[PDB]
RNA sequence: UUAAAGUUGCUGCAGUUAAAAAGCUCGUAGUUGGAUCUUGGGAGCGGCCGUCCCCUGCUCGGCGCCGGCCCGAAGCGUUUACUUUGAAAAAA
RNA sequence: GAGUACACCGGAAUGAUUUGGGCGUGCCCCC
């Protein structure tokens, strides 16, 4: 089940078996990549880029119109973010919880959630360190929140 | 978390055979499972089995007729030599006339009798009778 | 011409005739608008099950995407050229031996035998796609691959099952059947 | 029970079961081709859009984000496109 | 069982369920040996020959004996294929 | 002091009520980790299968032939456990 | 050619004449 909560769940995507682009999709690869570049320049993340492309443009997912994934394409062009999106979201959530905790010191549940979130951050940062994407001297620190917005 | 697909497949097929079902599907598929089912079919214990392919992991349906008492797994994969085969098979099999023990070998995943015939050893996988 | 071979080998009369016929057809029909540099690799003739013969055409991998819009009418033109001869367009891909610890760059998964076999199977049937694969293992340990093809566009390739099976068996060595379901479309 | 046919289940049985418990994993979602009598250009949308969409041509808001499908704006025709 | 010559030392061969392929013990009173008579195709008449079935006590106890008998009669050629 | 002791349980013991699951969670060591990279044919010893060769390449020579070819080698080969083998392994 | 389901044409068919449209390929309007 969930890594921290004791709840068990089953809800995620289910890709189809047929690995072929549908015939009704007239969009090529070049224009899809152009739209991806435009959305990246607008200031979005690969989490929402696929959502927008599968909602408005009607493409199922990128991995069939092209070969490289969204993050792969962003890395190829070079405007990909320097920090992973999920780690950024976890850091932002931790900062929000700490900002809530600075004033209200009696909210024990907030302290517990902050501890759990910092644990998740450490566990993900260890994998990033061992997969050679962050410097070995990179460390998550409690006070360092303004720089890592 | 599933730590051994083979152990779960053996437990599931054992439960299905004990209840009295005619066929059962195994969610995870691996090459060693296919080899072990092939060993059973060559020894004449189960029937035709159908591997079903998807783009994530296959599924296997086995025609169990009547001939399995139980069929199980030994973990971890203990390494056994030729001189230790007799000690394992005396205290692992119900008798000496029938029953087989399979073990991985660089010459092929085979039963204990064939391993003795080809004069080789390896790592024990399980047993069936 | 159009046929290009790896080494300086003289193609047999059949391959030269096929290349010349394809050149004449593209010059005559309205396909030369997109068939100038689109060349052919090689060709073969076999004997499939029954009193018919099949034609095998090899395809360069990068330029297959340009071919993908052509097989709609090219096979019909070849059938008009030879009635009792079936023509199929299949890609030719390179296979590398498994890196045994006695025998250098990394071997990509695109060149492995499994990927090559899957590509051959999925390119042998161009009009109808693949719904699912169900391999049956005989009592003797032999396999029997069954492939489910798309129910749509079925009234033009339902008679090609025998030549598909023959070509795939001769190129690979596996017994393959073909069936059509209806529970989805 | 004891003697079923898991190789060839009836379509009713397969559609009864969950999407990830079927014999092969297949989503139950699909794409749409929504259009309105106002504008005369046709767009392509996803069933579970979960995002507000504006018709290309600034006509009106077409879909609505909900828990499951999308609340199509009244006065719109859609068809199930498939291959 | 065999020996040097090839004769049989087992003093009796036990029965075996026609459905679950499980043998029937001596002190198993729940086992049933059922006889089903066939009908000639020409007019419909009793001829004299019969077909014999056997179901172990476990199947009846769990409650799947009737389905097994139906399957056996369908396979032998008694119950209509369309059914 | 050993077997009886499946009452020290690695094979191979127990934990609701007889002895026994930390009040709960996170967590560094330690332990355990999903699927997938290799395949078939050719010839043959024979009555499907008992049995056979093939799937690491690149300066010096003798089973030899009539400048053309193999043969052996002073010189290498991703690393480990596993498995079979040989040597080295005092006597009683 | 941007509005509709419409007006000009070209490939193409049998010296000459040519068959209602929309892009959501199968259903939506016109009679």
Swiss-Prot record, chain A:
GO biological process: translation
Cellular component, GO annotation: cytosolic ribosome; cytosolic small ribosomal subunit; nucleolus
Cited SMART domains: Ribosomal_S13_N, Ribosomal_S15
Highest taxon above the source species: Eukaryota
Modified residues (N6-succinyllysine): 26, 33
An example molecular function term from Gene Ontology annotations: small ribosomal subunit rRNA binding
Keywords: Acetylation, Cytoplasm, Isopeptide bond, Nucleus, Phosphoprotein, Ribonucleoprotein, Ribosomal protein, Ubl conjugation
Family per similarity comment: Belongs to the universal ribosomal protein uS15 family.
Official protein name in the record: Small ribosomal subunit protein uS15
Taxonomic lineage from the root: Eukaryota, Metazoa, Chordata, Craniata, Vertebrata
UniProtKB/Swiss-Prot annotation, chain B:
BP GO terms, sorted: translation
Main location: cytoplasm
Chain positions found as N6-succinyllysine: 87
GO terms of molecular function: structural constituent of ribosome
Disulfide pattern: none
InterPro entries in alphabetical order: Ribosomal_uS8 (IPR000630), Ribosomal_uS8_CS (IPR047863), Ribosomal_uS8_sf (IPR035987)
Compartments where located: Cytoplasm; Nucleus, Nucleolus
Keywords: Cytoplasm, Nucleus, Ribonucleoprotein, Ribosomal protein
Keyword Ribonucleoprotein: yes
Matches recorded under SUPFAM superfamilies: Ribosomal protein S8
GO cellular component: cytosolic ribosome; nucleolus; ribonucleoprotein complex
Keyword Transit peptide: no
NCBIfam families (alphabetical): PRK04034.1
Record's function text: Component of the small ribosomal subunit. Part of the small subunit (SSU) processome, first precursor of the small eukaryotic ribosomal subunit. During the assembly of the SSU processome in the nucleolus, many ribosome biogenesis factors, an RNA chaperone and ribosomal proteins associate with the nascent pre-rRNA and work in concert to generate RNA folding, modifications, rearrangements and cleavage as well as targeted degradation of pre-ribosomal RNA by the RNA exosome. Required for proper erythropoiesis.
PANTHER family tied to this protein: 40S RIBOSOMAL PROTEIN S15A
Family (UniProt): Belongs to the universal ribosomal protein uS8 family.
Subunit structure: Component of the 40S ribosomal subunit. Part of the small subunit (SSU) processome, composed of more than 70 proteins and the RNA chaperone small nucleolar RNA (snoRNA) U3.
Stated name of the protein: Small ribosomal subunit protein uS8
Gene: RPS15A
Curated annotation (Swiss-Prot), chain D:
PROSITE patterns assigned: RIBOSOMAL_S27E
Record-level GO BP terms: ribosomal small subunit biogenesis; rRNA processing; translation
Reported cofactor(s): Zn(2+)
Residue spans of biased composition, Basic and acidic residues class: 1-15
Major place of residence: cytoplasm
Cofactor comment text: Binds 1 zinc ion per subunit.
One Gene Ontology molecular-function label: zinc ion binding
Keyword Zinc-finger: yes
Pfam family, one: Ribosomal_S27e
Cellular compartment(s): Cytoplasm; Nucleus, Nucleolus
Span list, region Disordered: 1-22
UniProt xrefs under InterPro entries: Ribosomal_eS27 (IPR000592), Ribosomal_eS27_Zn-bd_dom_sf (IPR023407), Ribosomal_zn-bd (IPR011332)
Function text: Component of the small ribosomal subunit. The ribosome is a large ribonucleoprotein complex responsible for the synthesis of proteins in the cell. Required for proper rRNA processing and maturation of 18S rRNAs. Part of the small subunit (SSU) processome, first precursor of the small eukaryotic ribosomal subunit.
Complex formation: Component of the small ribosomal subunit. Part of the small subunit (SSU) processome, composed of more than 70 proteins and the RNA chaperone small nucleolar RNA (snoRNA) U3.
Name recorded for this polypeptide: Small ribosomal subunit protein eS27
Name of encoding gene: RPS27
UniProtKB/Swiss-Prot annotation, chain E:
Annotated positions of the N-acetylmethionine modification: 1
Protein localization: Cytoplasm, Cytosol; Cytoplasm; Rough endoplasmic reticulum
N-terminal signal peptide: none
Cross-referenced Pfam families: Ribosomal_S21e
Cited InterPro entries: Ribosomal_eS21, Ribosomal_eS21_CS, Ribosomal_eS21_sf
The UniProt record lists the keyword Cell membrane: no
GO biological process: translation
UniProt entry keywords in alphabetical sequence: Acetylation, Cytoplasm, Endoplasmic reticulum, Isopeptide bond, Ribonucleoprotein, Ribosomal protein, Ubl conjugation
PROSITE patterns for the chain: RIBOSOMAL_S21E
Keyword Ubl conjugation: yes
Top-rank taxon: Eukaryota
GO CC aspect terms: cytosolic ribosome; ribonucleoprotein complex; rough endoplasmic reticulum
Role according to the record: Component of the small ribosomal subunit. The ribosome is a large ribonucleoprotein complex responsible for the synthesis of proteins in the cell.
Complex and partners: Component of the 40S small ribosomal subunit.
Name recorded for this polypeptide: Small ribosomal subunit protein eS21
Species this chain originates from: Oryctolagus cuniculus
């Amino acid at each position: 089940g969930r890594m921290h909560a004791p709840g068990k769940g089953l809800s995620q995507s289910a890709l189809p078996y047929r690995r072929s682009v549908p015939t009704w999709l007239k969009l090529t690869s070049d224009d899809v990549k152009e739209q991806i570049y435009k959305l990246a320049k607008k200031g979005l993340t690969p989490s929402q880029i696929g959502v927008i492309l599968r909602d408005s443009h009607g493409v199922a997912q990128v991995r069939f119109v092209t070969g490289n994934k969204i993050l792969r394409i962003l890395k190829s062009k070079g405007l990909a973010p320097d920090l992973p999106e999920d780690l950024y979201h976890l850091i932002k959530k931790a900062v929000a919880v700490r900002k809530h905790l600075e004033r209200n010191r009696k909210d024990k549940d907030a302290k517990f959630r902050l501890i759990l979130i910092e644990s998740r951050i450490h566990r993900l940062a260890r994998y990033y360190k061992t997969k050679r994407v962050l410097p070995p001297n990179w460390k998550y620190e409690s006070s360092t929140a303004s720089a890592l917005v | 978390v599933r730590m051994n697909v083979l152990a779960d497949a053996l437990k599931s097929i054992n439960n299905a055979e004990k209840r009295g079902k005619r066929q059962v599907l195994i969610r995870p598929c691996s090459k060693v499972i296919v080899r072990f089912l092939t060993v059973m079919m060559k020894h004449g214990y189960i029937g035709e089995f159908e591997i079903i392919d998807d783009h994530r992991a296959g599924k296997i349906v086995v025609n169990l007729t009547g001939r399995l008492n139980k069929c199980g797994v030994i973990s971890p994969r203990f390494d056994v030599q030729l001189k230790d085969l007799e000690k394992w098979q005396n205290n692992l099999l119900p008798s000496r006339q029938f029953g087989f023990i399979v073990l991985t070998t660089s010459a092929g995943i085979m039963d204990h009798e064939e391993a003795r015939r080809k004069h080789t050893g390896g790592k024990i996988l399980g047993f069936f009778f | 011409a159009k046929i290009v071979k790896p080494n300086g080998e003289k193609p047999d009369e059949f391959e030269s005739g096929i290349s010349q016929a394809l050149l004449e057809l593209e010059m005559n029909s309205d396909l030369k608008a997109q068939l100038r540099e689109l060349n052919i690799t090689a060709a073969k003739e076999i004997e499939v099950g029954g009193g018919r013969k099949a034609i095998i055409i090899f395809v360069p991998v990068p330029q297959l995407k340009s071919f993908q819009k052509i097989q709609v009418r090219l096979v019909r033109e070849l059938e008009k050229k030879f009635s009792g001869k079936h023509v199929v367009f299949i890609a030719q891909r390179r296979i590398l031996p498994k890196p045994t610890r006695k025998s250098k760059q990394k071997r990509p998964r695109s060149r492995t035998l499994t990927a090559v076999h899957d590509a051959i199977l999925e390119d042998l049937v161009f009009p109808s796609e693949i719904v699912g694969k169900r391999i049956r293992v005989k009592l003797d340990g032999s396999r029997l691959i069954k492939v489910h093809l798309d129910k749509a566009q079925q009234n033009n390739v339902e008679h090609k099952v025998e030549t598909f099976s023959g070509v795939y068996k001769k190129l690979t060595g596996k017994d393959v059947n073909f069936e059509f379901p209806e529970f989805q479309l | 029970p004891l003697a079923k046919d898991l190789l060839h289940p009836s379509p009713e049985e397969e559609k009864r079961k969950h999407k990830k418990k079927r014999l092969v994993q297949s989503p139950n979602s699909y794409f749409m081709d929504v259009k309105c009598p106002g504008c005369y250009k046709i767009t392509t949308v996803f069933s579970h859009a979960q995002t507000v969409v504006l018709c290309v041509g600034c006509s009106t808001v077409l879909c609505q984000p909900t828990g499951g499908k999308a609340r199509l704006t009244e006065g719109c025709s859609f068809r199930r496109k498939q291959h | 069982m065999q020996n040097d010559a090839g004769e049989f030392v087992d003093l009796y061969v036990p029965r075996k369920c026609s459905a679950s392929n499980r043998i029937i013990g001596a002190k198993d009173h729940a086992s049933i040996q059922m006889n089903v008579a066939e009908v000639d195709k020409v007019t419909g008449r009793f001829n004299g020959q019969f077909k014999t079935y056997a179901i172990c006590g476990a199947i009846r106890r769990m409650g799947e004996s009737d389905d097994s008998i139906l399957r056996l009669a369908k396979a032998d050629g008694i119950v209509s294929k369309n059914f």
